[PDB]
Scaffold this motif. Sequence first.
Motif, short mmCIF file in Angstrom:
data_model
loop_
_atom_site.label_atom_id
_atom_site.label_comp_id
_atom_site.label_asym_id
_atom_site.label_seq_id
_atom_site.Cartn_x
_atom_site.Cartn_y
_atom_site.Cartn_z
N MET D 37 -59.43 2.84 -10.90
CA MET D 37 -58.28 2.28 -11.59
C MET D 37 -58.15 0.79 -11.28
O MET D 37 -57.86 -0.02 -12.17
CB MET D 37 -57.03 3.05 -11.18
CG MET D 37 -55.71 2.49 -11.66
SD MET D 37 -55.81 2.07 -13.41
CE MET D 37 -54.61 0.77 -13.52
N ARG D 38 -58.40 0.40 -10.03
CA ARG D 38 -58.45 -1.01 -9.69
C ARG D 38 -59.82 -1.62 -9.95
O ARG D 38 -59.93 -2.85 -10.05
CB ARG D 38 -58.07 -1.21 -8.22
CG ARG D 38 -56.63 -0.85 -7.89
CD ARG D 38 -56.39 -0.89 -6.38
NE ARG D 38 -56.55 -2.23 -5.82
CZ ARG D 38 -55.68 -3.22 -5.96
NH1 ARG D 38 -54.54 -3.05 -6.61
NH2 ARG D 38 -55.96 -4.41 -5.43
N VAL D 45 -66.34 -7.06 -14.50
CA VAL D 45 -66.93 -5.73 -14.66
C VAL D 45 -66.81 -5.31 -16.11
O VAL D 45 -66.00 -5.84 -16.87
CB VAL D 45 -66.28 -4.69 -13.72
CG1 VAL D 45 -66.63 -4.98 -12.27
CG2 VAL D 45 -64.78 -4.65 -13.94
N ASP D 46 -67.64 -4.35 -16.51
CA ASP D 46 -67.61 -3.85 -17.88
C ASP D 46 -66.60 -2.71 -17.97
O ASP D 46 -66.79 -1.68 -17.30
CB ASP D 46 -68.99 -3.36 -18.30
CG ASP D 46 -69.09 -3.02 -19.79
OD1 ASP D 46 -68.08 -3.12 -20.52
OD2 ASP D 46 -70.19 -2.63 -20.23
N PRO D 47 -65.54 -2.84 -18.76
CA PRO D 47 -64.55 -1.76 -18.88
C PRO D 47 -64.97 -0.63 -19.82
O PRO D 47 -64.12 0.21 -20.15
CB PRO D 47 -63.31 -2.48 -19.43
CG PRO D 47 -63.60 -3.96 -19.29
CD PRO D 47 -65.08 -4.06 -19.43
#
Lengths: 148, 145, 67, 48, 114, 82, 145, 257
Positions: D37-38, D45-47
């Motif tokens: 979640m964090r 970073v790639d979501p």
Amino acid sequence: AGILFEDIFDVKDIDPEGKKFDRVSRLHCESESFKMDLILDVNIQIYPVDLGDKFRLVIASTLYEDGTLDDGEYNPTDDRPSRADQFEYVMYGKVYRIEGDETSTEAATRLSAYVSYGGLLMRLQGDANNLHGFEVDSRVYLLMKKLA
Amino acid sequence: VKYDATVRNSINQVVQLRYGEDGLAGESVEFQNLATLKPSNKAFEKKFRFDYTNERALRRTLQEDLVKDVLSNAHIQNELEREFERMREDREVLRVIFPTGDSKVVLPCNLLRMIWNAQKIFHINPRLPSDLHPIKVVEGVKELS
Amino acid sequence: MIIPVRCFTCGKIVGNKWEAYLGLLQAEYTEGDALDALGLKRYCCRRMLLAHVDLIEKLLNYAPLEK
Amino acid sequence: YMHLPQTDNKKKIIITEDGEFKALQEWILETDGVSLMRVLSEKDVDPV
Amino acid sequence: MNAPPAFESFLLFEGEKKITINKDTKVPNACLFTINKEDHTLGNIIKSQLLKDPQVLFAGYKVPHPLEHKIIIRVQTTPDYSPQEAFTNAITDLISELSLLEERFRVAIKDKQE
Amino acid sequence: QANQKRITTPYMTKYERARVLGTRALQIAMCAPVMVELEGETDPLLIAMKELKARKIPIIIRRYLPDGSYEDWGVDELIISD
Amino acid sequence: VMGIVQDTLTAVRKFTKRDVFLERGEVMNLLMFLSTWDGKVPQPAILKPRPLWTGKQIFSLIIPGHINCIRTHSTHPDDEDSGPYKHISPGDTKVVVENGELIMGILCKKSLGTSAGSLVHISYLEMGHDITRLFYSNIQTVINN
Amino acid sequence: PYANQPTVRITELTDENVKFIIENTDLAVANSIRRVFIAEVPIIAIDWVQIDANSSVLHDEFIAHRLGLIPLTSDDIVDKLQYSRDCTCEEFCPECSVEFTLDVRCNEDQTRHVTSRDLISNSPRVIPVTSDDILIVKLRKGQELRLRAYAKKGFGKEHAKWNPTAGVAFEYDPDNALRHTVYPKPEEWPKSEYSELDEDESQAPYDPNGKPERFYYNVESCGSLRPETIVLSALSGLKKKLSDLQTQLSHEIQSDV
Ligand SMILES: [Zn+2]
Ligand SMILES: [Zn+2]
């Protein structure tokens, strides 16, 4: 007269990839008149063969030499029509693939026919005017005899 | 699976709308190859356009009364261009659904095997040109589906 | 227990050779020469005479239950 | 942990200008413990 | 407790015949011998002696199961020669075969004994 | 329901095939009339399979939709998977 | 999961090779153990000097109907497909079954065993279920004998 | 199309071993003659035993089995006595069987060896092989053994006690010529007894027109039958079996027509 291919061949290689199977050897052949190369699997214990040996090849649909079909059944008592028995080594098999060199514009400047003798295979690159008699899924014979 | 072909629980709670998201049993399904996901755009256009500008390959593949109808009757040409556009958007759909180029995928009945069976049952010759008009294939697929 | 009369594989007579085998073993002969002197050319009877242990001398050390 | 993947499951696969799938080796990170979640809320970073 | 008594390997009780003749319908001029209560000892002889005959196309034997003491022999000949009389010839020359072998073994024994 | 508005897969599946082939053969076993001519066999399974091939089976199949409403199908309009 | 195992598979391997050849007395007894045999002795692959039957024609007689299948043997050389002799296979790999006739190849676990797209799988999916049972029984009879 | 012309040659005719060579004969014929040697040669052996008193540590079943597998001479009268099943006699008669009486009692300190010599018959032409003797059971002092035994007629298919051979050896094509066996390393295999090659050669050259012939036999009797009459009995039994097949086939083909 039922003959689909007439040529005289000569060998140069006995096993270029090695002696893979003990009773079957893979010959490499080419002619001297119309220039078709050949590969073939021949039994050895019933038929010795060596390098530098000349032979002529006959491929026929039927052995009757009369145009009548044999339909592919073993009839040892039907020697009445005097089958092609003057030649001392006879195979029987079928084709499975006939592929050449097509670029979808011209029509088969060279043809390479694949024939299966129940596992023993051959191959014939050559001009289409000598290999047009072969049709896919057809039963053919092979004839062999020694030459002086 | 109830008789509405909907996967349901004991107290009739829907788990799947159809069995395996498609309604097909797993006994008959086979491993197949799409052969559309992996080729590039140039290869896809080369292998699925049905070009007719050169006109000589089309003469070699079909009979004369067939190439006469193909080289005219531009409605047929429009139909095959519509089929090519449909296959292009299908290629886009397959690329969106399938990442990583996993061309191996399970389908019910193995198409290449039945095509080979149809080749080797009716004793057709691949060397000779055939007698099969393209829109017979087109509306055969459309009326089949 | 007791020597069998026949070899299991072939069926050559075995039961008439146990006493002779012990007699030739007592007269300083090796197992191979004793087996060769009994005419056991095949190894199937050689293993029958060689690998048999006798238990009857252990069983006849007991008093019989009748008379 | 840092390691360039070798199996094609974790490798970068994108479409190209010629429409051909190409295997691209990109740096991936494997951790111990879950704090996703964090993790996706963090920079670079790639979501997806 | 289900051990069969050893005599049914070759005895015949009341209810079955020694030889039964079935005519095969897959190929013309064929027979299906069903010799009962022998073993491969007869069948190998039948197969070899019938392969010695030139005008017999198919003549072979097999056992359906090693428990059921039964062999089946399928003989197919040319369409001018019955398989039953082919079997009859293959047995009546076999009788002469065994009698000649017996006589030659007898005279060999007699010559060896002084 | 009526003749119209009747939806279910028309391929008679293996489960009702087994059920019909059992029930009708047991009806032969309890001396019911046989809908087909037979030529010298006595096993009820064999004649029941033969008349299932002949598609002359005199029972109907009441299929339970998960909604609750029934739906009746005979044998002669269902087609054999084999 | 119905699959040839433990003994019959490794005997099919040795019966399927090129080098095996049966005299008339060997094919003569191997044709007895069939059940689906039509009753006609096939034409031998070798006629002169003496009639010899290869095992691939026997296994072609085993294969029922018209089955089309292409599998690869376990010791398939990876360089054979890219280079020449792709359909010749000097190692006699690349099992192809054409119109119910075994053409080349030595059979193995990848062709007759419990594998997807195997020969028995295609035999089940094309001929049916009874014919597959007869296929298994004929294999287990003739190969063991 | 007809039967061929076999020849026989005998190389050894000792009292318990016979080696003969059969030439010009198919493989199946020689294999069948080998099979009939150990399966279908008639012989007299004990099958019916009745125990009256057995105080031995070897119980009834041990003694019954050992007495069943004692060989009995049947050199001349094996043909005369009929089978017990085919006898019109009920149970047993002296024409259909041979009666054995065994009675022995140990009353001495040393071990009494009850051997096959103690078996007493009625017909003098049937006797266990003593004319070393076969051990049966050892008895301590005060232990008795009284029994009666009956000897039937049978061959090796019923039981192995009716097998007349000691062990048969069957050799054809001694040095390998037809490639019936494929030796991976031919130099590692010893030459056969009947081989006809020198030390340098390993196998005979290939013979494509060959056929298996010149069979070597090394049949060996167990002392019950003579090793030369067993072959004659086997050939006679095979001839009678094929004559029975002739009769049954003729009856069936007249019944069908
Ligand atoms: Zn032994
Ligand atoms: Zn009596």
